[PDB]
Amino acid sequence: SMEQVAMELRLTELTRLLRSVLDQLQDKDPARIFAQPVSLKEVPDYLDHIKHPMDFATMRKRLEAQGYKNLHEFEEDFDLIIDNCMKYNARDTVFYRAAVRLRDQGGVVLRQARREVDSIG
């Protein structure tokens, strides 16, 4: 149907916008602390602590499968990165501190992407 096509084109454009958002968020993590999943070889007990792991590579796979239906779903995954880190790691660690900075600096990027998604429909 012509309707399924137009829907598909909207999803493609949402994907294009979220890709740019993701690149901007990932630049706020220059140390690459959140680039890849926490290694279960190196932290064998991680899943006893964190029930829903998340990282920027796993978000990127989901993105390119057009697996995000809206900005809210994307933000949920971004928030998991930060919130998992802040529970697993103590306050006085390079890891926790990096999460706090990513959170604070991402807020600006997400503030405007919420307006661009409402604006462009």
Swiss-Prot record:
It is found in: Nucleus; Chromosome. There is a cross-link at K41 (Glycyl lysine isopeptide (Lys-Gly) (interchain with G-Cter in SUMO2)). Highly expressed in testis. Residues 9-113 form the Bromo domain. It comes from the Eukaryota. Component of some HBO1 complex composed of KAT7/HBO1, MEAF6, ING4 and BRD1/BRPF2. Component of the MOZ/MORF complex composed at least of ING5, KAT6A, KAT6B, MEAF6 and one of BRPF1, BRD1/BRPF2 and BRPF3. Interacts (via PHD-type zinc finger domain) with unmodified histone H3. Interacts (via PWWP domain) with dimethylated and trimethylated 'Lys-79' on histone H3. Scaffold subunit of various histone acetyltransferase (HAT) complexes, such as the MOZ/MORF and HBO1 complexes, that acts as a regulator of hematopoiesis. Plays a key role in HBO1 complex by directing KAT7/HBO1 specificity towards histone H3 'Lys-14' acetylation (H3K14ac), thereby promoting erythroid differentiation. This is Bromodomain-containing protein 1. It comes from Homo sapiens.
